[PDB]
Amino acid sequence: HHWGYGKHNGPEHWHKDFPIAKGERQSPVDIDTHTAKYDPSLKPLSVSYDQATSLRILNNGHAFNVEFDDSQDKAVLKGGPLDGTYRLIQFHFHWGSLDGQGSEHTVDKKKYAAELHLVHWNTKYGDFGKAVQQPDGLAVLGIFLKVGSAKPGLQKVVDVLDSIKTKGKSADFTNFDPRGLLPESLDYWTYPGSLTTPPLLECVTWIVLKEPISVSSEQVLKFRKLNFNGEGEPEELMVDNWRPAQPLKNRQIKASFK
Ligand SMILES: NS(=O)(=O)c1cc(Cl)c(Cl)c(S(N)(=O)=O)c1
Ligand SMILES: [Zn+2]
């Protein structure tokens, strides 16, 4: 009875195996744009993906992860609310069964069609495994996806999904440039949170971009053709793998813009 997004193993059930699910700094959260306060103490956000080196893509049973080689000082996120440097390890998405839902964070209660998460770990902790055990161990850059014009830089990801339809399947995914998934503006909201999937560790500094990227209906439709199940099992379409907004618990969401 592994965790998932279904009626009997979904978000409302996670707290049983992962008590922290009802913690003080859980993610995602609704971003109230009027309550978010501009913070002039925020340094410019720095996204350096020029040397990013992807290794492969994997269907983990709830979504798919595009993993990167993080053994060297490449693809780093710094600045903004961050102290030190965070290294890119993987990215994945959360999406819905319909265009009207799919994102984890919401803006003034608005739900986007999907959400891209670029996960980075704080280099001062040596590696990802140790980083997740720290309050400031990870920095996740969140980007909203809306349905409209196609995102050229996403097509390579979309075309390889046919090869990792079911749980446990993986495939070589080299030379993918994450820069092609970034919107024009780096304006963002930031707050202290957690992993949005079990183990739900509260080790994340969330940086959510205000500007969404546009992807075509055809692109997101291919996301929905993935399977939650493994090869040779009853087909359960991989859709609605998002966790709903959690209590803000007095935390304050800071904005990098006015
Ligand atoms: N289990 S996972 O690979 O989906 C996953 C792993 C990690 Cl480390 C993080 Cl931060 C996230 S998230 N949704 O960005 O909080 C998801
Ligand atoms: Zn995520």
Pocket test for ligand 1, best of 88, 89, 92, 120 (most atoms within 8 A of CB): 92
CA–centroid distance, residue 103 to ligand 2 (Å): 9
Atom of ligand 1 minimally distant from the CA of 65:
3
Atom of ligand 1 minimally distant from the CA of 89:
8
CA–centroid distance, residue 84 to ligand 2 (Å): 22
- Whole-angstrom Cα distance, residue 53 to residue 69? 6
Return the ligand number nearest the Cα of 206.
Answer: 1
- Whole-angstrom Cα distance, residue 183 to residue 210? 9
The DSSP annotation for the chain comes to ----SSTTTSTTTHHHH-GGGGSSS-S--EE-TTT-EE-TTPPPEEEE-TT--EEEEEE-SSSEEEEE--SSS-SEEEETT-SSEEEEEEEEEEE-SSTT---SSEETTBPPSEEEEEEEEEGGGSSHHHHTTSTTSEEEEEEEEEESS--GGGHHHHHHGGGG-SBT-EEE--S--GGGG--S---EEEEEE--SSTT--S-EEEEEESSPEEE-HHHHHHHTT-BSSBTTS---B-----PPP---TT---EES--
Residue owning the nearest CA to atom 13 of ligand 1: 196
Q: Is 195 in the pocket of ligand 1 (CB under 6 A)?
A: yes
Query: Parallel, antiparallel, or unpaired: how do β-strands 138-147 and 204-209 relate?
Result: parallel
Resolution in angstrom units: 1.6
The response to whether 117 counts as a known ligand-binding position is yes
User: Do residues 91 and 65 lie in contact, with contact meaning Cβ atoms separated by under 8 Å?
Assistant: yes
Residue 66, token pair as written in the block: 């595009």
Residue 109, token pair as written in the block: 């209660």
- Whole-angstrom Cα distance, residue 172 to residue 165? 14
Non-local (6+) Cβ contacts of 62 within 8 A are 4, 5, 197, 228, 238, 241
- Whole-angstrom Cα distance, residue 125 to residue 86? 10
Complete domains list, the chain, with CATH: 1-258 (3.10.200.10)
User: Do residues 47 and 41 lie in contact, with contact meaning Cβ atoms separated by under 8 Å?
Assistant: no
Residue 151, token pair as written in the block: 């995102």
Q: Is 62 labeled as catalytic in the residue annotation?
A: yes
Q: How far is CA 36 from CA 48, 163, 213, in A?
A: 26, 42, 22
Strand partners, 149: none
Residue 106, token pair as written in the block: 């919401």
The response to whether 15 counts as a known ligand-binding position is no
Return the ligand number nearest the Cα of 63.
Answer: 1
CA–centroid distance, residue 116 to ligand 2 (Å): 7
Residue owning the nearest CA to atom 3 of ligand 1: 65
CA atoms within 13 A on the CB side of 169: 15
Query: Parallel, antiparallel, or unpaired: how do β-strands 54-59 and 64-68 relate?
Result: antiparallel
CA–centroid distance, residue 94 to ligand 2 (Å): 6
Q: Is the dihedral of CA 129, 175, 205, 43 positive or negative?
A: positive
Q: Is 197 in the pocket of ligand 1 (CB under 6 A)?
A: yes
Q: 125's torsion region: left (phi>0), alpha (psi -120 to 50) or beta?
A: alpha
User: Do residues 198 and 243 lie in contact, with contact meaning Cβ atoms separated by under 8 Å?
Assistant: no
Atom of ligand 1 minimally distant from the CA of 142:
14
